[PDB]
Design a binder for this molecule. Structure first.
Ligand code: YU3
Ligand code: ZN
Ligand code: ZN
Length: 231
């Protein structure tokens, strides 16, 4: 019994998984174009409050996420950051905002969500527009590694726990293919992974946007699957 997998989660429920003291991932499943996929997000203790990273991919899933957090953890989710503009990151922002959660994303993510017709986080995160940029946000550091899975993708580091949340710029070890690359920059993705590797060499856990956490090997693995895809 370990990390919850796609066939173990019916669409509509949410699981929480303890990563480190004060750090959990959240896992839910959603259908898209006629197939079912898991996806991850993060929850980080922020004093006596919680910071949420990414929705649970859908309105119902995200309402279930809030209910699961309340049951299991019982501290208020005050703020959320979405790490890029796709529905597995922002779908559910309307639920969060109606629940009083202040929602944030980079201006790039906000513009791309608006243009695509996805739900739009409220507040812009400045200081992240150039590759290599980093800012603090509560108990995490936000890092813009460059264009990869999407042009706006952000990664999240929890310094107290050495947890690197790569989001969809990072793939799980069991992958051989590169996921949904419709909005990817395949020319820049390897360079962006190299920036992550250089910036977070002490990460002890690496969490992908979809699938199982592991160690630092997920970074080079991601560069390899991107190469396999390109060719
Ligand atoms: C919502 C989002 C999306 C919407 C619109 C444009 N673009 C998008 O991405 C989306 C919808 C449906 C599927 C995905 C996968 C994905 C697919 C396959 C695998 C297994 S694998 C690594 O073995 O290929 C995976 F891990 C993730 C990913 C990802 O790659 O982030 N995003 C997905
Ligand atoms: Zn995506
Ligand atoms: Zn994704």
């Amino acid at each position: 019994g370990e990390y919850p997998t796609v066939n173990e989660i019916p669409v509509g429920e949410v699981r929480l998984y303890q990563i480190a003291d004060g750090v959990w991932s959240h896992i839910a499943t959603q259908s898209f174009d006629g197939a079912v996929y898991p996806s991850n997000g993060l929850i980080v203790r922020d004093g006596d409050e919680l910071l949420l990273i990414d929705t649970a991919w859908g309105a119902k899933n995200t309402a279930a996420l809030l209910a699961e957090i309340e049951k299991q953890i019982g501290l208020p989710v005050t703020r959320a950051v979405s790490t890029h503009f796709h529905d597995d990151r922002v779908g559910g922002v309307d639920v969060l905002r109606a629940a009083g959660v202040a929602t944030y994303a980079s201006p790039s993510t906000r513009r791309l969500a608006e243009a695509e017709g996805n739900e739009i986080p409220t507040h812009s995160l400045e200081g992240l527009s150039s590759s290599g940029d980093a800012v603090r946000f509560g108990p995490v550091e936000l890092f813009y590694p460059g264009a990869a899975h999407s042009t706006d993708n952000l990664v999240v580091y929890v310094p107290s726990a050495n947890v690197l949340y790569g989001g969809c710029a990072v793939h799980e070890l069991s992958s051989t293919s590169a996921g949904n690359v419709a909005d990817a920059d395949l020319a820049e993705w390897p360079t962006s992974v190299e920036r992550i590797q250089k910036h977070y060499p002490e990460a002890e856990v690496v969490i992908p946007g979809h699938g199982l956490p592991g160690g630092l090997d997920l970074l080079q693995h991601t560069a390899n699957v991107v190469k396999a895809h390109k060719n």
